[PDB]
Amino acid sequence: GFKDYGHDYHPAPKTENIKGLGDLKPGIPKTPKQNGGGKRKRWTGDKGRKIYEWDSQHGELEGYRASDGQHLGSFDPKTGNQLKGPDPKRNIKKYL
């Protein structure tokens, strides 16, 4: 039943509570999941040079370089601290 569905994934942070990455604005969401009809919630920061996307299974922001989509690592929305570092294999270049 429905509450159960609501605990399947980690709720995304509301924009105002994302700390430590500067001023942020939601961006048009474009990255599909394979299971789910949704596109990943998206924010831009640093004049749009940085993109962040909520990953609702791990419960962290994945950060990307807007110019080419390169992955930058993940960040704790409460602090803004880097948690994972860049993964050269990962980018969002087809979803920019």
């Binding site: 609501g6 709720p11 789910g36 596109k39 919630k41």
Partner: protein, 84 residues
């Protein structure tokens, strides 16, 4: 509970122009039922393109006067325990 998280963007520039949450639905998902969005893998898991059909179904829950000829709209189905 469940809030519809509504978000909209300029068709010309894609700039962000607004965000509004519906009131809390508690644990009643039927609004998702009326959109035709299964619960499975869809709660706290992304945003959906607000299509023309969805406007009438959604508008009753928002102050924003949804205008799909002006803006691209997206909704997500956020669920958090309690009041939030």
């Amino acid at each position: 509970g469940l809030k519809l998280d509504l978000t909209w963007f300029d068709k010309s520039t894609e700039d962000f122009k607004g965000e509004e949450y519906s009131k809390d639905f508690g644990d009643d998902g039927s609004v998702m039922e009326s959109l035709g969005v299964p619960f499975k893998d869809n709660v706290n898991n992304g945003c959906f393109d607000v299509i023309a059909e969805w406007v009438p179904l959604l508008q009753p829950y928002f102050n924003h006067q949804i205008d799909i000829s002006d803006n691209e709209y997206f909704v997500s189905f956020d669920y958090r325990d309690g009041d939030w």
